[PDB]
Ligand binder design. Structure first.
Ligand SMILES: Oc1ccc([C@@H]2Oc3ccc(O)cc3[C@@H]3CC(F)(F)C[C@@H]32)cc1
Ligand SMILES: Oc1ccc([C@@H]2Oc3ccc(O)cc3[C@@H]3CC(F)(F)C[C@@H]32)cc1
Lengths: 221, 224
């Protein structure tokens, strides 16, 4: 019942992470990095509140968290930036516009992928309910391996899909359009995965250790 | 309009399928894969040009899509011809590799595992021949965001191929909830194809045949 469409969406609503303030006393990358570390903590809490997630093997839980985190953060970023072209609302005291991305090399390229994907969600008029479904799906779909408890993950992923399909249905649009909107949303996931891969590569080409800090949190989990 | 109809479209993509590519071998594993990719790219252009309406996009978009997708389309091809043989990758008729051979070159094993794992999901879903034809066109048409944010034309084309896939899934006979679930399951896999594509690109650029520059030459010739 907790995985019933309407109930599931309300449950994901309440599970939303709080606002994160970095509280600033290289530096741009310092801030982004301090932010990620803080957001990751709340991201774990968020996942655990997704009905059934805690019931997957701890193996799958850790697996999913480890490979999704960057995507989920960027999905979050895109959603709070969605109404402001040219800008990225990373956090309540960290708003960066595109050009601030020229400072650090390699980043401008990523800002442009994030801004372009956000632009696309804006054009589709992504709803609050749809966004809650898509973000859970990003988590649940982040890793193939735990799927090829696997029974449980597949069932959970189907449940969230049903909820997204349900959300699209009460849209009142025709059945052809419903299929098209589902397809348009899911194809955007490719692009969120893409920006995620670019941001990971760049983070690792860098000389705060988010990834190791994440692994500590995961061992804590 | 009618040439983009679900039935005609699937048949048109069928005929547009690239030929078998023989690498014809007289570092080495990576030499082979690289010489193969280069040969496949030529035919991939031809393939794209046969997708109804592709040629009627701006040359700028045609080049954007081709440059962004090529690795994904290649890997989509790989997964499809490997789909019935777990543990193996049929790259080409004289180049079959199994997981283990991926240990030789460093970094490659991880990619093989992503490819093999994605191929296994396509096998579990029982990907159909005409579903595969639709998905691979979608991979091309959805490879780059920028050309969409002639943009009217690309969105129309992307909708036509999607309609065709939805149509393919419909005549499957299954219920309406399952049709939605199948569409969703297929498209979520695109994320994993994109992913393997990104790992394979990164690995290719960390290397010391120049596939990407050779692609840009082909792209300039396509342009001239
Ligand atoms: O809510 C958040 C969402 C995403 C992030 C990431 O932060 C870093 C940090 C170091 C690094 O090298 C790459 C990145 C990537 C790429 C990006 F576009 F700059 C932002 C990404 C952080 C918080
Ligand atoms: O049909 C084909 C499909 C994909 C390819 C690619 O070939 C190279 C070549 C050099 C390199 O550094 C990376 C890769 C990636 C990664 C991979 F898994 F090894 C195979 C990929 C080639 C032909």
């Amino acid at each position: 019942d907790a995985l019933s469409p309407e109930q599931l969406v309300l449950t994901l609503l309440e599970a939303e992470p709080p606002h994160v303030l970095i509280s600033r006393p290289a530096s741009m990358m310092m801030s982004l990095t301090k932010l990620a570390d803080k957001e990751l903590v709340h991201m774990i809490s968020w996942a655990k509140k997704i009905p059934g997630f805690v019931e997957l093997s701890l193996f799958d839980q850790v697996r999913l968290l480890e490979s999704c985190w960057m995507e989920v953060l960027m999905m979050g970023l895109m959603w709070r930036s969605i109404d402001h072209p040219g800008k990225l609302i990373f956090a309540p005291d960290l708003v960066l516009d595109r050009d601030e991305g020229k400072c650090v090399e390699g980043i401008l390229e990523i800002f442009d992928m994030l801004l372009a994907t956000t632009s696309r969600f804006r054009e589709l008029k992504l709803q609050h309910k749809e966004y809650l479904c898509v973000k859970a799906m990003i988590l649940l779909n982040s890793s193939m391996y735990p799927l090829v408890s696997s029974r449980k993950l597949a069932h959970l992923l189907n449940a969230v899909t049903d909820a997204l399909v349900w959300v699209i249905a009460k849209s009142g649009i025709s059945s052809q359009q419903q299929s098209m909107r589902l397809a348009n949303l899911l194809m955007l996931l490719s692009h969120v995965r893409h920006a995620s891969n670019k941001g990971m590569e760049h983070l690792l080409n860098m000389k705060v250790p988010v990834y190791d800090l994440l692994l500590e949190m995961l061992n804590a989990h």
